[PDB]
Every structure is written in C-alpha cells, then in structure tokens.
Amino acid sequence: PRVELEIPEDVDAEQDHLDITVEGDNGSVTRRLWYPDIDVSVDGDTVVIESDEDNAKTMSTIGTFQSHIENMFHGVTEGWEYGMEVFYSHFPMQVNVEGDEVVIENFLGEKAPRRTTIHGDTDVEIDGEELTVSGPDIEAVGQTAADIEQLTRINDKDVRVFQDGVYITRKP
Amino acid sequence: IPEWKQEEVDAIVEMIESRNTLLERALDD
Amino acid sequence: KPGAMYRNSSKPAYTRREYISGIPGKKIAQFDMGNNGAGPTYPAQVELVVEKPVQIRHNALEAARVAANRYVQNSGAAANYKFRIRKFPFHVIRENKDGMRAPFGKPVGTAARVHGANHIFIAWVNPDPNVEEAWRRAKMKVTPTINIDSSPAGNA
Amino acid sequence: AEFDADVIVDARDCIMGRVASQVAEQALDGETVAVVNAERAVITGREEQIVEKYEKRVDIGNDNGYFYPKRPDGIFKRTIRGMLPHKKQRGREAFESVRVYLGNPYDEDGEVLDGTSLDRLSNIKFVTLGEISETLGANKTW
RNA sequence: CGAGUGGCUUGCUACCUCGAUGUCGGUUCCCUCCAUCCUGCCCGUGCAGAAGCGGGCAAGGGUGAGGUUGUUCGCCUAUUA
RNA sequence: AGCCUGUGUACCAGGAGGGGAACAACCCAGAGAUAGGUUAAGGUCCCCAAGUGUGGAUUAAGUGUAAUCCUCUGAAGGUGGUCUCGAGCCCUAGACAGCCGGGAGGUGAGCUUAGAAGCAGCUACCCUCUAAGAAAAGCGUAACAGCUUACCGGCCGAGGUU
Ligand SMILES: [Cl-]
Ligand SMILES: [Cl-]
Ligand SMILES: [Cl-]
Ligand SMILES: [Cl-]
Ligand SMILES: [Cl-]
Ligand SMILES: [K+]
Ligand SMILES: [Mg+2]
Ligand SMILES: [Mg+2]
Ligand SMILES: [Mg+2]
Ligand SMILES: [Mg+2]
Ligand SMILES: [Mg+2]
Ligand SMILES: [Mg+2]
Ligand SMILES: [Mg+2]
Ligand SMILES: [Mg+2]
Ligand code: NA
Ligand code: NA
Ligand code: NA
Ligand code: NA
Ligand code: NA
Ligand code: NA
Ligand code: NA
Ligand code: NA
Ligand code: NA
Ligand code: NA
Ligand code: NA
C-alpha cells in the first residue's frame, strides 16, 4: 500500500529518519512516526506513507499516520482550538493562567488551589466564563483542554448534583 | 439493471419530450 | 452432585429394569412441546447437535429443556412451533454412598447416552428463529459443546 | 583496564542472546573477546513481560544468595556465563577471557557479528538493556 | 442446571516409616500465600449529604485486650481504622 | 486414586549400552574381548558432538521451545486479535458510512377522554402533492412543542454487506 498527501501551499514539511516536522504561518510540529515496515518520506510536493504489507495491523497504522499528518497541516495553518466554559453553582470558581499552567481556585470552596501544566506551545486565553485552548499541535492542545476539565474531576460525591467544573464546549 | 431506474429514465424522457444521473441519462436521449 | 461423576460413558450399559429396582423417577416433564397437534409442516427446522459422546442426567435434560422451551415464549404460550427432545434417560446410575468393601453402588438416578453428532433437540419454526436463541440457552446446561444446526431453511 | 581482545564485538542494536551464544563459542575456542556498548544491546519482546522476568531475578534470593546483576554491564556477562560450563576449568578460563563494556573504551569500532543485528525499521517490540537496568534501579552511569 | 480451581476439612487408598520421623491444644520465634478485614488508589449504586452496600487494583504495614472451656472451633464483653 | 480385582501381550523383577535434565518397566537396543567404520532412538544457537540449513506460511502470547506421564493441566463459555477458503445480495444508472438539505399537506385521522394532536388505550390505516415522507420505528410533553428512524435529493468516489 501507498498513500500520497499533497502538502498545502501554505506549508513546508521536512523529514529525516522517523521524525517529520511541519511548519506553517501558525507554527511548527514535529512527530515521530515509527511502525514496522512503514516508510514516511517527503517527495517534493507530497508526503508519502507506504509499506510492502497489507495486513490489518499495517493498514491501521497507515490510516493513523495519514490523519496525524493532515492534522499537522491544519495546525500550522488554520490552527486548533477548543472552547471551554467554567461553571459553578455556589462557590465562584476562579480560573487563571499563571505561568505555563492554568490555576483554579475556590473549587467547591477548596482552600487549596488546583492546577495543571499546559502542554507545548498551547495558548490558553481566558475571557470571563469562557476559555479557548489553541495551538498547532493537536496532541498538546487536546490534552491541555482535557487536563483542564479533568482537573475538576470529583469521585467522592454525586456528580449529578455537584456539577461545578470547566468543560469542553466546542471540539475542533 | 434496476427496473425502477429504467422506468425513471423513461418518465424523464417523456417529460423532456413534452437523480442527476437519471436526468443526464434522459438528456443523452 | 457434580456431572463430573456421571458424564462419561466408560461403564457398561445398565438399563435392565428386570434386575434393577428403586430407580428414581425422571424429572423431564415433556418430550413434545408447542403445537403437538400439528405435524412437522414448517418451513424451518433447527436442531441442537451434541458434539461429544456423553451421559446427560435427567437433571440436565429437564433444566436444558425448560430453559429452552420456557424461553420459546417469545412466541407465546400457544405459539406456532413444535419442540422435540428425542432422547430418554435409559442408563441407570449408581453411587457408593464400609469403604471400598461391597462398593456396588445403590441407584441414585438416570441419564441419557448421546453420541457425538446426534441431535438431542429439534424445533420446527416458520421464518422466526427465536429457537436459535432458545438453544444457546439449552447447550448452556448440558455438559458438551454443541452445534446449532438448521436443516430445511435456505431462507438466509 | 587494557584488555588484549582478539575480537571486539559491538552490541549496539544486536540480539543479546545471539551475540552471547557466539561470544561463548569463540571464547571456548581460545579467543579473548570484548563486548562493547552493552547498554545499547537489545532483546525482542513485550517490554512488560521482559522486565517482569528480570525483576523477578532481582527479588529472588536468600541467605545462600542469588546475586543477579542490574547494570547492562553484568546482565550481558551473566548471559554469557549461562552459555559456558563456568565451573569447569576450561569454562572458567573462557569466561574470564571475556569482558563486557558500557560504551566503548577502545579506539577501534567493534565488529558486528552475523545474524545478530536487529532492524529498528521493521521492529517495534524490543527493549534496550540500558532501559532494563533503569527500570531495575541501576544508576545510569552511561 | 452446566464447567472448574484449591489442597484448609472429611472420606477413600494402603505407596513410605512398625531394629519408633515423640500426641492434641497452647506458647515463643522466623518466613510466606491472597480467595483483602482495615489502610491507599479506583468503579457502580436503589450514589443529595452523612452513613452504607457491592465491585476492581493491591500483600507495604496493621489485624490488639479480656469472661466460660484442655479445647481447636465457637459463644460472649468492652475497646478498635 | 501412584485404588481394588480379571484378561491377552511385552517388559521390570533377573536386562547392560544409547536417548529421555534426573527416573525399574517410555523410545532405540538385547551384550564375549579388542579395533576401524555406519547407523538407530534422539538431536544439530550456546552449555553440547552436528545447521544460527533451504523453499514457504502462521503466531506477538515469551503463546510456544512439554511424545508418553502421579509427573507435561487447563474447561464450559466467550473473542471486529489476526490469517485463509467459500456462498448470497448490493454497487460508477454511484453502492456502505459520514456530512448538508428535504422529511410536505387533507390532518391536530376517527374512537374513546375535560384531554389526547405519530407515539395512554381501541379501530383503521386510507389519497394528495412529489424526487421523497408511516394514519408513524424511538425519545420527549400534563397534553402541545422539540429531537430523530423510516423514506428522497446532493456532496463524495470504490468497493460494500450478510
Ligand atoms: Cl540474595
Ligand atoms: Cl560448569
Ligand atoms: Cl514489532
Ligand atoms: Cl536376550
Ligand atoms: Cl522469556
Ligand atoms: K511406625
Ligand atoms: Mg457520601
Ligand atoms: Mg526427630
Ligand atoms: Mg486479587
Ligand atoms: Mg510481606
Ligand atoms: Mg526378585
Ligand atoms: Mg559444537
Ligand atoms: Mg509458558
Ligand atoms: Mg498430553
Ligand atoms: Na464392614
Ligand atoms: Na456446554
Ligand atoms: Na527475546
Ligand atoms: Na537476586
Ligand atoms: Na526405622
Ligand atoms: Na503444640
Ligand atoms: Na497488605
Ligand atoms: Na475464649
Ligand atoms: Na527380559
Ligand atoms: Na538417561
Ligand atoms: Na515462556
């Protein structure tokens, strides 16, 4: 099998060994794409993913490499953004960006601030009760958004009653 | 060889006398 | 008592009631189920086939049958289908319940000997195989692994 | 320090067992062998089960003792010892004329033995001795 | 109803010892197993909370003092995570 | 039951030597001494004599590398893990999936019921417009609304489904 991905005019993709880097006006993302007998190479205007095997396990990874690269094309141009919404019922939750990590205070009245560290070059811009997580690396942005939501996870009590927390509102 | 498709290409050609593929079909007639 | 004790056919056939007394009655309630008034005049005929020669205690037959027919009530108490368990527990089984002295056991029950590939159950249905399910439940209560086989039915 | 090796073998990206088997055979033939870059040697399989085995060996023991090595250094040497009758005179002589090294203290670049190399491009299920030692608690002195 | 795992009980067998492998219970002192009682981290709930019930990972540590009985076991009391 | 008790046979007992990690009866093998040679069972990556042998395929679990067995467990049941072979049906007159749009009126059918309007229960389930559209397959409402399946059209482009 062999798939060809025509790279966007807006982008440049280089690759040595098992590492591929994609640069665009919005940034640059480098990934490792390592799998038995799957070659990824940059043939001028198109990135090529090929292999001499067609077994199910191989086709699975080929399809995965594809979406991974296309996702990079998108991240270096249009970019990736997740929208979030802070929400509380009794205690005013305070979500601030301090350093390279987002801090949440007064969660359910908690005295101890809850926090999490942002992944890579991901921007977490907060405006009122709305958050926007963005960047060129979907992996990083996706996790940062997720971690934020996970950060308000509660297991001790009934979630249906205690719904406070920040949640992903819009997925790219 | 679906028949309903064959009949449509006819009905279409009829109204042309007095799906897109079926219209383009009739037109080819 | 576990089936481990009686599922094998390693003992001589022991079925002569003229020389054996005190044989417990069978727990199997019926052998003909559904519309026994009608004859196999159905489109589809599925069978539960045993895949290994084994002994099946009347205990397992009843539970297997009930679990299948009690379920075939996805069609209704007077539904249109007929169910048949073709085997009967002829083999009398003993237990040595003194130690190994004068150990010939006393009669404790009965079992049916089924050879691999025979059909123990046969159902007759119109294209409405809920019976295929009644059997997934039936071979669940008998020792052997089983094959659910359909005969008259090219309506796939 | 200073080892007149008649043969210097490079273990980088090679199957530990297949190298060991050959280094054993050669030492019993009278050759003085040195295995280089032990930390970069490799063993195929699922890292999780592989590590469980070696971890079990570390935990095994008692007063009589079962000294199992943690550094890629000894792991490899013990591996070779298992392919030699190390308690017989001949066996101990051969074993003592074999030494494993972390990295390469020599000037020459060791040679790659036939049928011991692993192609990283067609293999994903394998582990580095160095990684194993790190898991075991070894002090990454390399 | 069906299929199993363990080798703590009981039974079976009679392989080992009758030129003897010192009994039950207790005690003291050491190691271990997990099918987890508590503790850690979790899932479900007929999960509002609190208090629970059930389940998963998990053997690091803990799992105590007493009244009757030779008792093992077990019954009972007050403490206890 | 490494149980008890028959039977036929070969073996141990009273049977070496080779193999099986060890091991009375499993495999080869029945054996004067000494010597050269070739095989048997079994084995040829190292320990360990002989292949890191050849053509091809499967397995990712260290499954497995365990003839036989007290000794080598692993079962009923389950598996869109993966490989191979077959049959039926659909498809460039554009299939399967997804996304976008349409899902219309007589009409909120009649009946019962304050009520009931696709959807409490009962009966029926007709015809119009049309390229589609149930007298409504699933939610939802006090009943409506709202959200969707069926059904049609578009985008897309190659196999898909049982
Ligand atoms: Cl030790
Ligand atoms: Cl030795
Ligand atoms: Cl691999
Ligand atoms: Cl002889
Ligand atoms: Cl292993
Ligand atoms: K004795
Ligand atoms: Mg609570
Ligand atoms: Mg003594
Ligand atoms: Mg456990
Ligand atoms: Mg302990
Ligand atoms: Mg004798
Ligand atoms: Mg040799
Ligand atoms: Mg194994
Ligand atoms: Mg076997
Ligand atoms: Na007696
Ligand atoms: Na069964
Ligand atoms: Na290996
Ligand atoms: Na040890
Ligand atoms: Na004695
Ligand atoms: Na004692
Ligand atoms: Na513990
Ligand atoms: Na007491
Ligand atoms: Na003899
Ligand atoms: Na031997
Ligand atoms: Na293994």
PDB file of N, CA and C in Angstrom, chain A residues 83-163:
ATOM      1  N   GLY A  83     -13.002  25.070  22.853  1.00  0.00           N
ATOM      2  CA  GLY A  83     -13.668  26.084  23.641  1.00  0.00           C
ATOM      3  C   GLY A  83     -14.147  25.489  24.942  1.00  0.00           C
ATOM      4  N   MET A  84     -13.942  26.206  26.039  1.00  0.00           N
ATOM      5  CA  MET A  84     -14.372  25.704  27.332  1.00  0.00           C
ATOM      6  C   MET A  84     -15.187  26.707  28.127  1.00  0.00           C
ATOM      7  N   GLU A  85     -15.968  26.184  29.065  1.00  0.00           N
ATOM      8  CA  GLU A  85     -16.814  27.009  29.909  1.00  0.00           C
ATOM      9  C   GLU A  85     -16.709  26.671  31.382  1.00  0.00           C
ATOM     10  N   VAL A  86     -16.297  27.640  32.186  1.00  0.00           N
ATOM     11  CA  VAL A  86     -16.224  27.409  33.617  1.00  0.00           C
ATOM     12  C   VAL A  86     -17.666  27.503  34.113  1.00  0.00           C
ATOM     13  N   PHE A  87     -18.004  26.717  35.127  1.00  0.00           N
ATOM     14  CA  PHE A  87     -19.352  26.730  35.674  1.00  0.00           C
ATOM     15  C   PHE A  87     -19.358  26.370  37.152  1.00  0.00           C
ATOM     16  N   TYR A  88     -20.179  27.070  37.925  1.00  0.00           N
ATOM     17  CA  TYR A  88     -20.278  26.813  39.355  1.00  0.00           C
ATOM     18  C   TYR A  88     -21.689  27.095  39.839  1.00  0.00           C
ATOM     19  N   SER A  89     -22.074  26.461  40.943  1.00  0.00           N
ATOM     20  CA  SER A  89     -23.412  26.643  41.490  1.00  0.00           C
ATOM     21  C   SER A  89     -23.466  27.463  42.784  1.00  0.00           C
ATOM     22  N   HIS A  90     -22.474  27.304  43.657  1.00  0.00           N
ATOM     23  CA  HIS A  90     -22.457  28.049  44.914  1.00  0.00           C
ATOM     24  C   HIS A  90     -21.167  28.834  45.085  1.00  0.00           C
ATOM     25  N   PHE A  91     -20.040  28.161  44.899  1.00  0.00           N
ATOM     26  CA  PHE A  91     -18.749  28.810  45.049  1.00  0.00           C
ATOM     27  C   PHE A  91     -18.202  29.349  43.739  1.00  0.00           C
ATOM     28  N   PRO A  92     -17.932  30.659  43.697  1.00  0.00           N
ATOM     29  CA  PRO A  92     -17.394  31.299  42.497  1.00  0.00           C
ATOM     30  C   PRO A  92     -16.020  30.732  42.191  1.00  0.00           C
ATOM     31  N   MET A  93     -15.954  29.945  41.128  1.00  0.00           N
ATOM     32  CA  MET A  93     -14.715  29.321  40.704  1.00  0.00           C
ATOM     33  C   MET A  93     -13.854  30.357  39.985  1.00  0.00           C
ATOM     34  N   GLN A  94     -12.574  30.415  40.333  1.00  0.00           N
ATOM     35  CA  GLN A  94     -11.674  31.365  39.697  1.00  0.00           C
ATOM     36  C   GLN A  94     -10.616  30.630  38.900  1.00  0.00           C
ATOM     37  N   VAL A  95     -10.658  30.797  37.585  1.00  0.00           N
ATOM     38  CA  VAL A  95      -9.709  30.137  36.702  1.00  0.00           C
ATOM     39  C   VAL A  95      -8.749  31.158  36.124  1.00  0.00           C
ATOM     40  N   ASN A  96      -7.471  31.036  36.460  1.00  0.00           N
ATOM     41  CA  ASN A  96      -6.476  31.965  35.950  1.00  0.00           C
ATOM     42  C   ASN A  96      -5.307  31.239  35.320  1.00  0.00           C
ATOM     43  N   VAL A  97      -4.637  31.928  34.406  1.00  0.00           N
ATOM     44  CA  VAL A  97      -3.470  31.389  33.728  1.00  0.00           C
ATOM     45  C   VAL A  97      -2.272  32.041  34.412  1.00  0.00           C
ATOM     46  N   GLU A  98      -1.445  31.249  35.086  1.00  0.00           N
ATOM     47  CA  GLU A  98      -0.286  31.796  35.778  1.00  0.00           C
ATOM     48  C   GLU A  98       0.953  31.003  35.412  1.00  0.00           C
ATOM     49  N   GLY A  99       1.789  31.575  34.551  1.00  0.00           N
ATOM     50  CA  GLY A  99       2.998  30.892  34.125  1.00  0.00           C
ATOM     51  C   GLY A  99       2.692  29.986  32.952  1.00  0.00           C
ATOM     52  N   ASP A 100       3.070  28.714  33.055  1.00  0.00           N
ATOM     53  CA  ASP A 100       2.796  27.765  31.980  1.00  0.00           C
ATOM     54  C   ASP A 100       1.776  26.739  32.441  1.00  0.00           C
ATOM     55  N   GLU A 101       0.912  27.155  33.360  1.00  0.00           N
ATOM     56  CA  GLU A 101      -0.114  26.273  33.888  1.00  0.00           C
ATOM     57  C   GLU A 101      -1.349  27.064  34.299  1.00  0.00           C
ATOM     58  N   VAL A 102      -2.523  26.472  34.118  1.00  0.00           N
ATOM     59  CA  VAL A 102      -3.755  27.140  34.496  1.00  0.00           C
ATOM     60  C   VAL A 102      -4.115  26.742  35.921  1.00  0.00           C
ATOM     61  N   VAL A 103      -4.390  27.740  36.746  1.00  0.00           N
ATOM     62  CA  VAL A 103      -4.732  27.504  38.136  1.00  0.00           C
ATOM     63  C   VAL A 103      -6.203  27.787  38.404  1.00  0.00           C
ATOM     64  N   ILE A 104      -6.829  26.921  39.190  1.00  0.00           N
ATOM     65  CA  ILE A 104      -8.231  27.089  39.534  1.00  0.00           C
ATOM     66  C   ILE A 104      -8.350  27.198  41.040  1.00  0.00           C
ATOM     67  N   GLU A 105      -8.964  28.278  41.508  1.00  0.00           N
ATOM     68  CA  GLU A 105      -9.118  28.490  42.938  1.00  0.00           C
ATOM     69  C   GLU A 105     -10.559  28.457  43.411  1.00  0.00           C
ATOM     70  N   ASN A 106     -10.717  28.184  44.698  1.00  0.00           N
ATOM     71  CA  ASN A 106     -12.021  28.121  45.330  1.00  0.00           C
ATOM     72  C   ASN A 106     -12.958  27.100  44.693  1.00  0.00           C
ATOM     73  N   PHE A 107     -12.415  25.987  44.207  1.00  0.00           N
ATOM     74  CA  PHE A 107     -13.266  24.964  43.607  1.00  0.00           C
ATOM     75  C   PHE A 107     -14.072  24.333  44.734  1.00  0.00           C
ATOM     76  N   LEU A 108     -15.394  24.366  44.616  1.00  0.00           N
ATOM     77  CA  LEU A 108     -16.267  23.826  45.653  1.00  0.00           C
ATOM     78  C   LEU A 108     -15.861  24.315  47.041  1.00  0.00           C
ATOM     79  N   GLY A 109     -15.297  25.519  47.098  1.00  0.00           N
ATOM     80  CA  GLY A 109     -14.881  26.092  48.368  1.00  0.00           C
ATOM     81  C   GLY A 109     -13.487  25.712  48.827  1.00  0.00           C
ATOM     82  N   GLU A 110     -12.825  24.836  48.082  1.00  0.00           N
ATOM     83  CA  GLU A 110     -11.480  24.395  48.431  1.00  0.00           C
ATOM     84  C   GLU A 110     -10.508  25.537  48.698  1.00  0.00           C
ATOM     85  N   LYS A 111      -9.713  25.389  49.755  1.00  0.00           N
ATOM     86  CA  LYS A 111      -8.712  26.390  50.117  1.00  0.00           C
ATOM     87  C   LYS A 111      -7.467  26.194  49.260  1.00  0.00           C
ATOM     88  N   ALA A 112      -7.184  24.940  48.923  1.00  0.00           N
ATOM     89  CA  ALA A 112      -6.011  24.606  48.126  1.00  0.00           C
ATOM     90  C   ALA A 112      -6.287  24.725  46.643  1.00  0.00           C
ATOM     91  N   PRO A 113      -5.516  25.568  45.954  1.00  0.00           N
ATOM     92  CA  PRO A 113      -5.682  25.773  44.516  1.00  0.00           C
ATOM     93  C   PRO A 113      -5.399  24.505  43.725  1.00  0.00           C
ATOM     94  N   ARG A 114      -6.218  24.233  42.715  1.00  0.00           N
ATOM     95  CA  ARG A 114      -5.999  23.071  41.861  1.00  0.00           C
ATOM     96  C   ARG A 114      -5.286  23.590  40.628  1.00  0.00           C
ATOM     97  N   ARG A 115      -4.340  22.821  40.112  1.00  0.00           N
ATOM     98  CA  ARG A 115      -3.614  23.270  38.941  1.00  0.00           C
ATOM     99  C   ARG A 115      -3.211  22.161  37.991  1.00  0.00           C
ATOM    100  N   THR A 116      -2.700  22.564  36.833  1.00  0.00           N
ATOM    101  CA  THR A 116      -2.246  21.642  35.805  1.00  0.00           C
ATOM    102  C   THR A 116      -1.322  22.416  34.884  1.00  0.00           C
ATOM    103  N   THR A 117      -0.316  21.745  34.344  1.00  0.00           N
ATOM    104  CA  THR A 117       0.628  22.399  33.457  1.00  0.00           C
ATOM    105  C   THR A 117       0.266  22.215  31.991  1.00  0.00           C
ATOM    106  N   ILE A 118       0.282  23.327  31.262  1.00  0.00           N
ATOM    107  CA  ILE A 118      -0.034  23.375  29.837  1.00  0.00           C
ATOM    108  C   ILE A 118       0.999  22.624  29.010  1.00  0.00           C
ATOM    109  N   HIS A 119       0.536  21.957  27.956  1.00  0.00           N
ATOM    110  CA  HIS A 119       1.416  21.189  27.080  1.00  0.00           C
ATOM    111  C   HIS A 119       1.889  21.964  25.859  1.00  0.00           C
ATOM    112  N   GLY A 120       3.200  21.942  25.631  1.00  0.00           N
ATOM    113  CA  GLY A 120       3.794  22.610  24.482  1.00  0.00           C
ATOM    114  C   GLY A 120       3.463  24.076  24.269  1.00  0.00           C
ATOM    115  N   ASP A 121       3.360  24.465  22.999  1.00  0.00           N
ATOM    116  CA  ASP A 121       3.050  25.844  22.630  1.00  0.00           C
ATOM    117  C   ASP A 121       1.544  26.051  22.538  1.00  0.00           C
ATOM    118  N   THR A 122       0.831  25.644  23.578  1.00  0.00           N
ATOM    119  CA  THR A 122      -0.612  25.792  23.592  1.00  0.00           C
ATOM    120  C   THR A 122      -1.007  27.050  24.348  1.00  0.00           C
ATOM    121  N   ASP A 123      -1.848  27.863  23.718  1.00  0.00           N
ATOM    122  CA  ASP A 123      -2.300  29.107  24.319  1.00  0.00           C
ATOM    123  C   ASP A 123      -3.646  28.910  24.991  1.00  0.00           C
ATOM    124  N   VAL A 124      -3.730  29.292  26.256  1.00  0.00           N
ATOM    125  CA  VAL A 124      -4.985  29.186  26.977  1.00  0.00           C
ATOM    126  C   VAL A 124      -5.428  30.596  27.314  1.00  0.00           C
ATOM    127  N   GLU A 125      -6.239  31.180  26.444  1.00  0.00           N
ATOM    128  CA  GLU A 125      -6.723  32.524  26.679  1.00  0.00           C
ATOM    129  C   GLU A 125      -8.079  32.436  27.347  1.00  0.00           C
ATOM    130  N   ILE A 126      -8.208  33.132  28.468  1.00  0.00           N
ATOM    131  CA  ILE A 126      -9.440  33.124  29.233  1.00  0.00           C
ATOM    132  C   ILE A 126     -10.128  34.490  29.288  1.00  0.00           C
ATOM    133  N   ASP A 127     -11.418  34.497  28.966  1.00  0.00           N
ATOM    134  CA  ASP A 127     -12.211  35.720  28.982  1.00  0.00           C
ATOM    135  C   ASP A 127     -13.547  35.467  29.672  1.00  0.00           C
ATOM    136  N   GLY A 128     -13.661  35.937  30.907  1.00  0.00           N
ATOM    137  CA  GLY A 128     -14.887  35.736  31.651  1.00  0.00           C
ATOM    138  C   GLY A 128     -15.112  34.266  31.941  1.00  0.00           C
ATOM    139  N   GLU A 129     -16.316  33.785  31.654  1.00  0.00           N
ATOM    140  CA  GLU A 129     -16.646  32.387  31.891  1.00  0.00           C
ATOM    141  C   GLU A 129     -16.409  31.549  30.638  1.00  0.00           C
ATOM    142  N   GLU A 130     -15.480  32.000  29.802  1.00  0.00           N
ATOM    143  CA  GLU A 130     -15.143  31.290  28.575  1.00  0.00           C
ATOM    144  C   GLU A 130     -13.639  31.121  28.426  1.00  0.00           C
ATOM    145  N   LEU A 131     -13.243  29.940  27.972  1.00  0.00           N
ATOM    146  CA  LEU A 131     -11.839  29.613  27.767  1.00  0.00           C
ATOM    147  C   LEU A 131     -11.622  29.133  26.345  1.00  0.00           C
ATOM    148  N   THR A 132     -10.444  29.421  25.812  1.00  0.00           N
ATOM    149  CA  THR A 132     -10.108  28.980  24.472  1.00  0.00           C
ATOM    150  C   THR A 132      -8.697  28.411  24.472  1.00  0.00           C
ATOM    151  N   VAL A 133      -8.599  27.109  24.234  1.00  0.00           N
ATOM    152  CA  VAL A 133      -7.310  26.435  24.198  1.00  0.00           C
ATOM    153  C   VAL A 133      -6.953  26.251  22.734  1.00  0.00           C
ATOM    154  N   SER A 134      -5.790  26.752  22.339  1.00  0.00           N
ATOM    155  CA  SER A 134      -5.378  26.658  20.947  1.00  0.00           C
ATOM    156  C   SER A 134      -3.884  26.478  20.762  1.00  0.00           C
ATOM    157  N   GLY A 135      -3.516  26.026  19.564  1.00  0.00           N
ATOM    158  CA  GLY A 135      -2.123  25.801  19.220  1.00  0.00           C
ATOM    159  C   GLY A 135      -2.043  25.022  17.919  1.00  0.00           C
ATOM    160  N   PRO A 136      -0.830  24.737  17.403  1.00  0.00           N
ATOM    161  CA  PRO A 136      -0.626  23.990  16.154  1.00  0.00           C
ATOM    162  C   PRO A 136      -0.502  22.471  16.334  1.00  0.00           C
ATOM    163  N   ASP A 137      -0.186  22.045  17.557  1.00  0.00           N
ATOM    164  CA  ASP A 137      -0.017  20.627  17.905  1.00  0.00           C
ATOM    165  C   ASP A 137      -1.316  20.106  18.512  1.00  0.00           C
ATOM    166  N   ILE A 138      -2.136  19.426  17.718  1.00  0.00           N
ATOM    167  CA  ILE A 138      -3.410  18.944  18.242  1.00  0.00           C
ATOM    168  C   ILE A 138      -3.259  18.059  19.478  1.00  0.00           C
ATOM    169  N   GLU A 139      -2.204  17.252  19.509  1.00  0.00           N
ATOM    170  CA  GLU A 139      -1.955  16.395  20.662  1.00  0.00           C
ATOM    171  C   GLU A 139      -1.881  17.257  21.929  1.00  0.00           C
ATOM    172  N   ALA A 140      -0.995  18.248  21.902  1.00  0.00           N
ATOM    173  CA  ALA A 140      -0.793  19.138  23.037  1.00  0.00           C
ATOM    174  C   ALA A 140      -2.043  19.926  23.427  1.00  0.00           C
ATOM    175  N   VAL A 141      -2.673  20.560  22.445  1.00  0.00           N
ATOM    176  CA  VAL A 141      -3.863  21.350  22.704  1.00  0.00           C
ATOM    177  C   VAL A 141      -4.960  20.470  23.283  1.00  0.00           C
ATOM    178  N   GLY A 142      -5.207  19.341  22.628  1.00  0.00           N
ATOM    179  CA  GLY A 142      -6.231  18.422  23.097  1.00  0.00           C
ATOM    180  C   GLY A 142      -6.063  18.008  24.551  1.00  0.00           C
ATOM    181  N   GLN A 143      -4.830  17.689  24.944  1.00  0.00           N
ATOM    182  CA  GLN A 143      -4.558  17.278  26.316  1.00  0.00           C
ATOM    183  C   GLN A 143      -4.748  18.426  27.290  1.00  0.00           C
ATOM    184  N   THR A 144      -4.216  19.594  26.931  1.00  0.00           N
ATOM    185  CA  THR A 144      -4.333  20.763  27.789  1.00  0.00           C
ATOM    186  C   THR A 144      -5.801  21.044  28.075  1.00  0.00           C
ATOM    187  N   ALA A 145      -6.639  20.925  27.054  1.00  0.00           N
ATOM    188  CA  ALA A 145      -8.063  21.154  27.239  1.00  0.00           C
ATOM    189  C   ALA A 145      -8.582  20.077  28.187  1.00  0.00           C
ATOM    190  N   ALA A 146      -8.284  18.831  27.844  1.00  0.00           N
ATOM    191  CA  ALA A 146      -8.718  17.696  28.641  1.00  0.00           C
ATOM    192  C   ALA A 146      -8.267  17.822  30.088  1.00  0.00           C
ATOM    193  N   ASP A 147      -6.977  18.063  30.288  1.00  0.00           N
ATOM    194  CA  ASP A 147      -6.456  18.183  31.640  1.00  0.00           C
ATOM    195  C   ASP A 147      -7.226  19.234  32.418  1.00  0.00           C
ATOM    196  N   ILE A 148      -7.570  20.325  31.754  1.00  0.00           N
ATOM    197  CA  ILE A 148      -8.308  21.357  32.443  1.00  0.00           C
ATOM    198  C   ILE A 148      -9.619  20.783  32.956  1.00  0.00           C
ATOM    199  N   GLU A 149     -10.360  20.099  32.088  1.00  0.00           N
ATOM    200  CA  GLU A 149     -11.634  19.520  32.501  1.00  0.00           C
ATOM    201  C   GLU A 149     -11.436  18.446  33.575  1.00  0.00           C
ATOM    202  N   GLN A 150     -10.429  17.598  33.383  1.00  0.00           N
ATOM    203  CA  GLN A 150     -10.130  16.537  34.343  1.00  0.00           C
ATOM    204  C   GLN A 150      -9.796  17.145  35.694  1.00  0.00           C
ATOM    205  N   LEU A 151      -9.137  18.296  35.660  1.00  0.00           N
ATOM    206  CA  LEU A 151      -8.718  18.989  36.869  1.00  0.00           C
ATOM    207  C   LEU A 151      -9.846  19.248  37.872  1.00  0.00           C
ATOM    208  N   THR A 152     -11.093  19.256  37.404  1.00  0.00           N
ATOM    209  CA  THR A 152     -12.235  19.480  38.289  1.00  0.00           C
ATOM    210  C   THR A 152     -12.995  18.184  38.557  1.00  0.00           C
ATOM    211  N   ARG A 153     -12.372  17.057  38.227  1.00  0.00           N
ATOM    212  CA  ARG A 153     -12.986  15.753  38.437  1.00  0.00           C
ATOM    213  C   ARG A 153     -13.311  15.535  39.909  1.00  0.00           C
ATOM    214  N   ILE A 154     -14.451  14.900  40.154  1.00  0.00           N
ATOM    215  CA  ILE A 154     -14.901  14.589  41.505  1.00  0.00           C
ATOM    216  C   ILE A 154     -15.408  13.141  41.539  1.00  0.00           C
ATOM    217  N   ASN A 155     -14.965  12.364  42.522  1.00  0.00           N
ATOM    218  CA  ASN A 155     -15.381  10.964  42.618  1.00  0.00           C
ATOM    219  C   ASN A 155     -16.135  10.691  43.904  1.00  0.00           C
ATOM    220  N   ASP A 156     -15.756  11.435  44.932  1.00  0.00           N
ATOM    221  CA  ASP A 156     -16.329  11.343  46.265  1.00  0.00           C
ATOM    222  C   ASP A 156     -17.846  11.507  46.338  1.00  0.00           C
ATOM    223  N   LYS A 157     -18.375  12.491  45.620  1.00  0.00           N
ATOM    224  CA  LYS A 157     -19.804  12.763  45.666  1.00  0.00           C
ATOM    225  C   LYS A 157     -20.532  12.675  44.328  1.00  0.00           C
ATOM    226  N   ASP A 158     -21.860  12.684  44.405  1.00  0.00           N
ATOM    227  CA  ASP A 158     -22.737  12.596  43.239  1.00  0.00           C
ATOM    228  C   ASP A 158     -22.493  13.720  42.235  1.00  0.00           C
ATOM    229  N   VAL A 159     -21.979  13.373  41.059  1.00  0.00           N
ATOM    230  CA  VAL A 159     -21.686  14.364  40.024  1.00  0.00           C
ATOM    231  C   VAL A 159     -22.924  15.067  39.474  1.00  0.00           C
ATOM    232  N   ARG A 160     -24.061  14.381  39.511  1.00  0.00           N
ATOM    233  CA  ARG A 160     -25.309  14.945  39.014  1.00  0.00           C
ATOM    234  C   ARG A 160     -25.746  16.155  39.842  1.00  0.00           C
ATOM    235  N   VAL A 161     -25.323  16.201  41.101  1.00  0.00           N
ATOM    236  CA  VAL A 161     -25.660  17.311  41.988  1.00  0.00           C
ATOM    237  C   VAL A 161     -24.519  18.327  42.039  1.00  0.00           C
ATOM    238  N   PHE A 162     -23.290  17.829  42.109  1.00  0.00           N
ATOM    239  CA  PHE A 162     -22.112  18.685  42.153  1.00  0.00           C
ATOM    240  C   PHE A 162     -21.536  18.728  40.747  1.00  0.00           C
ATOM    241  N   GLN A 163     -22.055  19.644  39.935  1.00  0.00           N
ATOM    242  CA  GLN A 163     -21.641  19.774  38.543  1.00  0.00           C
ATOM    243  C   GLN A 163     -20.581  20.832  38.263  1.00  0.00           C
TER     244      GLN A 163
END
